[PDB]
Each structure stands twice: as structure tokens, then as C-alpha cells.
Amino acid sequence: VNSFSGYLKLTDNVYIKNADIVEEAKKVKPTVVVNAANVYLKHGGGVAGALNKATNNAMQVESDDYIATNGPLKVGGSCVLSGHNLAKHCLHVVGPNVNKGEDIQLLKSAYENFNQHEVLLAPLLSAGIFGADPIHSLRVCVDTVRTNVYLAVFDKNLYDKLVSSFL
Numbered sequence: 001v002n003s004f005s006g007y008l009k010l011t012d013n014v015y016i017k018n019a020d021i022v023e024e025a026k027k028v029k030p031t032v033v034v035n036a037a038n039v040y041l042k043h044g045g046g047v048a049g050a051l052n053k054a055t056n057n058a059m060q061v062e063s064d065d066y067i068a069t070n071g072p073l074k075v076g077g078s079c080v081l082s083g084h085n086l087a088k089h090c091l092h093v094v095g096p097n098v099n100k101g102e103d104i105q106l107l108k109s110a111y112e113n114f115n116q117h118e119v120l121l122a123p124l125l126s127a128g129i130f131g132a133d134p135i136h137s138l139r140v141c142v143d144t145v146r147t148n149v150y151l152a153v154f155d156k157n158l159y160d161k162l163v164s165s166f167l
């Protein structure tokens with residue numbers, strides 16, 4: 001038994017809710033929140049900007065030190081950093097950005113990072129401003145992630161379509 005409430009069960013291990021992931025992280029304070037990162041950890045908008053804003057920019061300060069030491073992530077890659085006031089840890093995962101020409105086949109590699117963590121609060125990777133079809137992203141999630149994932153979908157209209165079209 002964990003602290004997540006009001007999620008619709010899709011599979012053995014995948015759960016979904018219409019929720020602001022920032023508000024969800026503040027309420028639950030999960031072990032791991034997933035950020036929809038880019039390779040530079042420049043948290044300007046969507047999930048990364050909202051979580052970064054909720055940390056009062058401490059996520060961006062930490063991220064800049066990480067990049068100055070280690071260089072950019074890979075598309076499909078991740079790093080673990082502090083969760084600040086939102087979570088124990090933030091798993092920054094880079095899904096492919098369709099609006100930048102990145103290989104959508106990298107979405108499965110991106111989701112494989114979640115398997116290193118027993119439980120996560122996460123967005124649908126490569127959805128929103130990353131330009132992928134959220135229906136596709138949910139299918140890859142269900143077919144790739146084996147650990148327990150709690151998906152927060154910001155848009156109520158998209159949430160209802162994700163549930164009602166789920167195979």
C-alpha cells in the first residue's frame with residue numbers, strides 16, 4: 001500500500017489520473033517524480049518548467065551544476081537528482097522531441113529508465129510540447145515499464161480519451 005489516491009488502474013503496474021503533476025507531487029511527496037527533461041536540463045516549460053517553478057528555481061540551479069560537470073544527457077537517457085520540495089528524487093528523463101526531429105523509437109529507451117525505480121509519479125514521455133501522440137506514449141509505457149508507475153495527465157480532455165481508447 002502506497003500514498004497515491006484516485007488513480008484508475010490500467011494494468012498490473014500502470015495507473016492514471018487527470019492531475020497537475022506539480023500539485024500531485026506536493027500532496028504525495030513521492031520517492032521519485034519524473035521530469036520531462038531535455039538533454040541540457042533547461043527547464044523552461046511544460047512539466048519541467050512547472051516543477052522547476054515549484055522548486056523556486058532550485059531544480060535549475062542543481063541541473064546547471066550537473067551539466068557543467070557531466071555534459072548533456074542522451075535522448076532516451078536520464079539522471080537522478082534531488083526532488084527538492086516535491087519528492088525525494090527527481091528522475092530527469094529525455095524522451096524524443098518530435099518538434100526537433102528526434103527518433104520516436106527512442107521513446108521505449110526513455111521509458112526503460114523507469115525500470116530502475118520501484119514506484120514513480122510520471123508524465124507521459126514525449127507528450128505535451130514534445131509533440132508525440134499521447135495515445136502512443138501510453139502504449140509504449142504499458143509495454144515497457146514493469147515497475148509501478150502513477151501517470152499524471154494535465155489535460156482533462158486528453159485523460160478521458162486516453163482511458164476510453166486504452167486497449
Ligand SMILES: O=C(O)CNC(=O)c1cccc(O)c1
Pocket residue numbers: 020021022045046047050123124127128129152153154155
Ligand atoms: O501532462 C502532460 O502530458 C503535459 N503536462 C504539462 O505540460 C504540464 C503539467 C503540469 C503543469 C504545467 O504547467 C504543464
